[PDB]
Amino acid sequence: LKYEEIDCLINDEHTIKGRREGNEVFLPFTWVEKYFDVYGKVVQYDGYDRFEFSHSYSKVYAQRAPYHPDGVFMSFEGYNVEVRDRVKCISGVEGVPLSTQWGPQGYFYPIQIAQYGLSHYSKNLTEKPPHIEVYETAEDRNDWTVPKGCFMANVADKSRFTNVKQFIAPETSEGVSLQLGNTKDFIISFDLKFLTNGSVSVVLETTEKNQLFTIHYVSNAQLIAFKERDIYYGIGPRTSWSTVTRDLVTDLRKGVGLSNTKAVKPTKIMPKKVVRLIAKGKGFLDNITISTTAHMAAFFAASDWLVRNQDEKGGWPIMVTRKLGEGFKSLEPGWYSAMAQGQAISTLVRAYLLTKDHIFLNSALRATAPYKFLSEQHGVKAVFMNKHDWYEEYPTTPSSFVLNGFMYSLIGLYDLKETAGEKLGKEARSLYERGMESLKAMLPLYDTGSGTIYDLRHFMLGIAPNLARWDFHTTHINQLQLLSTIDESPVFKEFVKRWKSYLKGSRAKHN
Amino acid sequence: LKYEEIDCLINDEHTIKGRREGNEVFLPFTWVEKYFDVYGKVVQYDGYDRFEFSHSYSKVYAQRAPYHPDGVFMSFEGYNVEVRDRVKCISGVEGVPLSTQWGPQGYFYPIQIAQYGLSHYSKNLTEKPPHIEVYETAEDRDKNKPNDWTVPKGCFMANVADKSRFTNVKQFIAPETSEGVSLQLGNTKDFIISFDLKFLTNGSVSVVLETTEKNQLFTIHYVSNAQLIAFKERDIYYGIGPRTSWSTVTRDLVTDLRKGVGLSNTKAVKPTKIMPKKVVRLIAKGKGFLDNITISTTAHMAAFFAASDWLVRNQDEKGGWPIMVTRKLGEGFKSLEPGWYSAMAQGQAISTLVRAYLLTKDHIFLNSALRATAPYKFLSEQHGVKAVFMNKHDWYEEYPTTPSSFVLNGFMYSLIGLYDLKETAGEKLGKEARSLYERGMESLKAMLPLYDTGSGTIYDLRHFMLGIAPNLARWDFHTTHINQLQLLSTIDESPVFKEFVKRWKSYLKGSRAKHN
């Protein structure tokens, strides 16, 4: 009811307007929010309005079980790699993300590709099975339009023990068209083999004023184009049988948001109906499908990409310049990352456990080699103060000692040593053991008393600490709580507990 | 539309009562204060109220000039050692503080003694000269008043030459069962009493004080025994030792009164608001001699030399001032048995001794300072103060713990002492100090960033040495850290000191390092 406006002098240098009722002073949240860097808003419920304050914005993952290498990967069941605006698109040829974080030109970032695979792996274990509608098997168990000038038939293919739909259509015609009409699901899948150049295109009804947009999957290696209401993805020659799987929601959003910058422009556009599929050129088509999700095809696109792109040193070279900050020498394209090696390993190990295909395990085993060589010999190892081995997310000179990347490097070694067995696992066992000793000793250097630091650049360069933003702080917690389920050391449990309290505004005691 | 109570849920786990007007929410300072550990109050101006918020308490010292060893010692012009409640009293025998911080029994803490001296030294340079009233010289300068002696039957007094120190002197004989001989003083403005004393027999020199507590009269007895302090009714007793040879006795009656009335068997003196408002008279009992009786606003230098003299006389053969109390730094550090050394003690002692040397040119002071570097050379476990961080950086330990503790501020004090000494001792004698300073300053520059949280400083590196939460430095240590670094930034031109001072000052106003 009754109050009194009062001047509030802040640190003797700015005045704000507060309110007073007797002895109690009330300060405007507008100030509190900005001055303390906190969060809150009024939430309206039925018959009750309530202001709701948060020290931080991120959340910690509620672990349902101890970590195991064949299970979900940490909290990645909730990751969403493809909406990240630093993902320019999902490659047509490779079926994996292309990053633009550190250059508008685009590049395959092995970390991003592995996360793509591990998140989809994790959602395969946690989400409900998808609806799968089948539109075309060409067998004896929703028809096609064939304009004059074109042709279609059911033909056997002994190489792949099924019937198959042949199509011939000039690239100057309407093409041959199959009516789909799906309202609910947006993952399109089909087996394809071209004899000549061509395209397979999908018409979408969209939420932007009921307009049709068309996505063309063209038989070239061009990445992505967008003109008016046509989006084009190059999917390569596809002259041998392959299953093409695309997420039309993502393919539409990335097209419409195409940008010459490092970030996709935001869009609200969604597809509301998969109208039809249009084939041009000469070729063959089978098992045409629309599904709610296709997690496994994504996981194997990442896994296959990692196998095929590993170098003979066992590394995934990162083909972009990385400038970590004033004081660190710039990393020329080709550098390795312990986070990439670890995340790749976690991916390949899971591919191996699913398939028993030893090419996956062989790729994983090779991937430990860079952990053995120092950064200046094109490895990822750094040594803290001539005493503790570390595996560098960014193998900088001087060394950088990024915490979260290191922990990811260790979870990979863990995945591998538990999967390869006693003899084959030896090197990974040894790198893990040395790493975990380093981690336990060095954790306290990342603890500010009300947060965490991202890296040790303050010490390595003589500068301000690089405080970890809250989404890295919760990553730190997520990583440590996972390690606490496969290593019984008290230190991990104590730090997890303290670092969680920091999310709620707890502080270490001052003297 | 209007202003209105609203429930405010904090971090999903407790609801407080705030206020709302439309889209603006207002939160009670009662919550803000506790939740964020900040400060403020409504301060009343003429007609007019204002709330005044502070991120911190404690101020940074406004350094007027580059540090030099003969000048003020950092910010100590504003230190007040004697009112600290961990100071049981000023020793009658020694003229220096006794601490009870880590034991109610009391002990001479060299750090406290050095601070006593360095603050008085600093105030000598910054304060106005004192008024000095002279009540008795026994000369022919004592032609006309002050007379003012009362000599009861049973007693006797005379002006007597003393060839041994070239002046006239007041002889007194009074039995210690009588009221004694009494000199009327009657000073209302100044409270430092001073007199030259020589007893032949046991005796006492006592001062009657009018006080602010309901006009009441208290007497402070300076007795010829070694008893520390006693208080009964309105009598306070300080033992000043035999005083059978000439010495100048100098006492602060404000301090001596307050420590008397506040006597306690605990580690803290009871607070009092009692002040003396008049030094009414001085009473001599026993047989002896008295000269140069004086009352002064201040006597900074007598304090500075009492500290300096105490340090010379109490140094051990390893050059140390052993700390004769058990010190348990916390869970994970072994307990330190009485006799441990402190690099802070060594440095502060050296800063004191160097100043005593520069004033007097008495090489005893310089030689005592030079000896005081020895403990810097030996590791904690061989009864020194050296520690080594990760087999790489020498450090000088405030608390020579196992494991090592790496307390920041004591280290910096250890370095300013070495600086004072290396600048003063000369090329040849300074060699060792120069070497310890150079190695220490390298260590400081390398290790500073480990004490920086991004919104404060840490006191020590126990988090790393024991695997536990950081020991965040409270704000009065945070400003000490700044004061120390800003001083170092005037004797070493390294950018790092200036960049850190700038950042660490911004933390006092709620600035933070950038997050990624």
Ligand SMILES: O=C(O)[C@@H]1O[C@@H](O[C@H]2[C@H](O)[C@@H](NS(=O)(=O)O)[C@@H](O[C@H]3[C@H](O)[C@@H](O)[C@H](O[C@H]4[C@H](O)[C@@H](NS(=O)(=O)O)[C@@H](O[C@H]5[C@H](O)[C@@H](O)[C@H](O[C@H]6[C@H](O)[C@@H](NS(=O)(=O)O)[C@@H](O[C@H]7[C@H](O)[C@@H](O)[C@H](O[C@H]8[C@H](O)[C@@H](NS(=O)(=O)O)[C@@H](O)O[C@@H]8CO)O[C@H]7C(=O)O)O[C@@H]6CO)O[C@H]5C(=O)O)O[C@@H]4CO)O[C@H]3C(=O)O)O[C@@H]2CO)[C@H](O)[C@@H](O)[C@@H]1O
């Ligand atoms: O389904 C939904 O619900 C979904 O909701 C939303 O999505 C949410 C998720 O659901 C949710 N999941 S949860 O389980 O429910 O919690 C959650 O997921 C996110 C997690 O919170 C997050 O932790 C996680 O992050 C990943 C990250 O995505 C991944 N990257 S990857 O795509 O590449 O794979 C990976 O990060 C790696 C990797 O190496 C780098 O990408 C990363 O790079 C760091 C830098 O190292 C760091 N450098 S530092 O500053 O030196 O420390 C820092 O650099 C930034 C700085 O911030 C910036 O200040 C600075 O600016 C430059 C500037 O660009 C320069 N310009 S230039 O000169 O022109 O070049 C110039 O001006 O200089 C300055 C600097 O001086 O530099 C930039 C920069 O260079 O990039 O930050 C970089 C990026 O963070 O670091 C590493 C690493 O691990 O450290 O792994 C991490 C961790 O696993 O994944 C999130 C996710 O999945 O999205 O929250 C989501 C909500 O946020 C969604 O919104 C809904 O739509 C959807 O519906």
Ligand SMILES: O=C(O)[C@@H]1O[C@@H](O[C@H]2[C@H](O)[C@@H](NS(=O)(=O)O)[C@@H](O[C@H]3[C@H](O)[C@@H](O)[C@H](O[C@H]4[C@H](O)[C@@H](NS(=O)(=O)O)[C@@H](O[C@H]5[C@H](O)[C@@H](O)[C@H](O[C@H]6[C@H](O)[C@@H](NS(=O)(=O)O)[C@@H](O[C@H]7[C@H](O)[C@@H](O)[C@H](O)O[C@H]7C(=O)O)O[C@@H]6CO)O[C@H]5C(=O)O)O[C@@H]4CO)O[C@H]3C(=O)O)O[C@@H]2CO)[C@H](O)[C@@H](O)[C@@H]1O
């Ligand atoms: O005349 C006036 O104007 C007066 O004003 C008011 O006084 C103010 C004064 O004016 C002002 N000066 S200024 O220039 O204007 O700024 C200012 O002076 C104070 C300084 O701000 C302050 O930094 C400084 O502190 C001294 C300290 O006094 C020294 N101690 S002493 O022995 O010489 O007397 C010395 O400290 C050393 C020493 O070794 C130890 O005493 C001390 O110990 C620490 C422990 O290390 C620490 N351990 S922990 O593991 O970190 O926890 C901790 O321990 C305690 C814990 O807090 C407790 O929770 C637990 O249970 O145990 C406790 C324990 O004691 O074991 O804290 C200990 C105590 O600090 O630390 C050492 C060190 O590291 O340096 O040197 C320091 C720094 O120089 O001196 C102040 C001073 O009085 O001069 O501010 C004052 C206001 O206080 C006054 O109100 C007014 O009446 C007066 O007229």
Ligand SMILES: *[C@@H]1O[C@H](CO)[C@@H](O[C@@H]2O[C@H](CO)[C@@H](O[C@@H]3O[C@H](CO[C@H]4O[C@H](CO)[C@@H](O)[C@H](O)[C@@H]4O)[C@@H](O)[C@H](O[C@H]4O[C@H](CO)[C@@H](O)[C@H](O)[C@@H]4O[C@@H]4O[C@H](CO)[C@@H](O)[C@H](O)[C@H]4NC(C)=O)[C@@H]3O)[C@H](O)[C@H]2NC(C)=O)[C@H](O)[C@H]1NC(C)=O
């Ligand atoms: C997580 O990932 C797991 C593993 O990938 C996944 O479970 C799998 O789900 C897929 C569906 O995408 C299943 O594939 C089907 O396999 C059928 C035979 O497979 C046997 O083998 C496995 C072991 O390897 C057994 O455990 C299993 O019980 C089976 O006996 C196969 O018949 C299916 O093929 C039909 O459907 C496809 C389109 O999906 C189509 O292209 C074909 O032409 C074919 O025709 C249609 O048949 C179905 C009857 O099945 C009929 O409904 C339909 O009407 C026919 N067509 C027409 C025109 O009428 C198919 O390939 C696979 O068996 C599952 N594996 C396991 C281990 O469970 C989870 O669903 C994923 N979860 C999440 C959340 O992502």
Ligand SMILES: *[C@@H]1O[C@H](CO)[C@@H](O[C@@H]2O[C@H](CO)[C@@H](O[C@@H]3O[C@H](CO[C@H]4O[C@H](CO)[C@@H](O)[C@H](O)[C@@H]4O)[C@@H](O)[C@H](O[C@H]4O[C@H](CO)[C@@H](O)[C@H](O)[C@@H]4O)[C@@H]3O)[C@H](O)[C@H]2NC(C)=O)[C@H](O)[C@H]1NC(C)=O
């Ligand atoms: C910082 O500290 C310094 C000194 O440590 C102070 O400056 C000194 O002030 C004192 C007085 O407080 C001076 O000492 C001497 O006083 C004698 C005065 O004689 C009368 O007073 C005595 C005692 O009170 C009576 O018994 C007697 O009846 C007299 O009536 C002088 O006789 C001395 O003169 C000579 O001393 C030295 C020679 O060694 C020289 O410095 C003098 O110039 C002179 O030759 C002397 O005056 C003394 O003058 C001051 N010393 C210095 C070095 O300047 C500051 O006051 C103090 N400041 C603060 C703020 O504390």
Ligand SMILES: *[C@@H]1O[C@H](CO)[C@@H](O[C@@H]2O[C@H](CO)[C@@H](O[C@@H]3O[C@H](CO)[C@@H](O)[C@H](O[C@H]4O[C@H](CO)[C@@H](O)[C@H](O)[C@@H]4O)[C@@H]3O)[C@H](O)[C@H]2NC(C)=O)[C@H](O)[C@H]1NC(C)=O
């Ligand atoms: C009360 O106060 C007065 C001072 O206000 C004080 O009288 C002064 O005492 C000093 C020292 O006793 C006298 O100075 C001495 O004078 C002789 C000769 O004039 C000097 O030779 C002495 O020097 C000695 O020290 C040096 C070696 O260490 C050498 O110089 C030499 O070898 C000597 O050993 C010394 O300077 C001073 O003259 C008087 N002043 C007056 C006005 O009388 C008195 O001592 C104080 N009362 C008490 C009880 O102390």
Ligand SMILES: *[C@@H]1O[C@H](CO)[C@@H](O[C@@H]2O[C@H](CO)[C@@H](O[C@@H]3O[C@H](CO)[C@@H](O)[C@H](O)[C@@H]3O)[C@H](O)[C@H]2NC(C)=O)[C@H](O)[C@H]1NC(C)=O
């Ligand atoms: C479209 O999907 C169907 C699956 O629904 C694919 O047909 C399947 O093809 C595989 C091999 O191509 C057959 O497995 C093979 O079986 C033979 C013996 O029968 C054996 O020699 C091989 O080792 C292998 O096990 C599978 O039985 C077959 N299933 C059916 C029901 O036909 C078809 O290939 C897909 N179309 C295209 C073009 O990929």
Ligand SMILES: *[C@@H]1O[C@H](CO)[C@@H](O[C@@H]2O[C@H](CO)[C@@H](O)[C@H](O)[C@H]2NC(C)=O)[C@H](O)[C@H]1NC(C)=O
């Ligand atoms: C002050 O009084 C004490 C007596 O209480 C005197 O000290 C004694 O002196 C004799 C030698 O003369 C010693 O053998 C005794 O052991 C001492 N007794 C005590 C209790 O200490 C002291 O000498 C007197 N002071 C003066 C200056 O004469």
Ligand SMILES: *[C@@H]1O[C@H](CO)[C@@H](O)[C@H](O)[C@H]1NC(C)=O
């Ligand atoms: C597709 O077109 C390119 C030239 O633009 C050609 O090299 C290639 O042979 C064509 N593919 C087939 C299968 O004919």
Ligand SMILES: [Ca+2]
């Ligand atoms: Ca078929």
Ligand SMILES: [Ca+2]
């Ligand atoms: Ca005289």
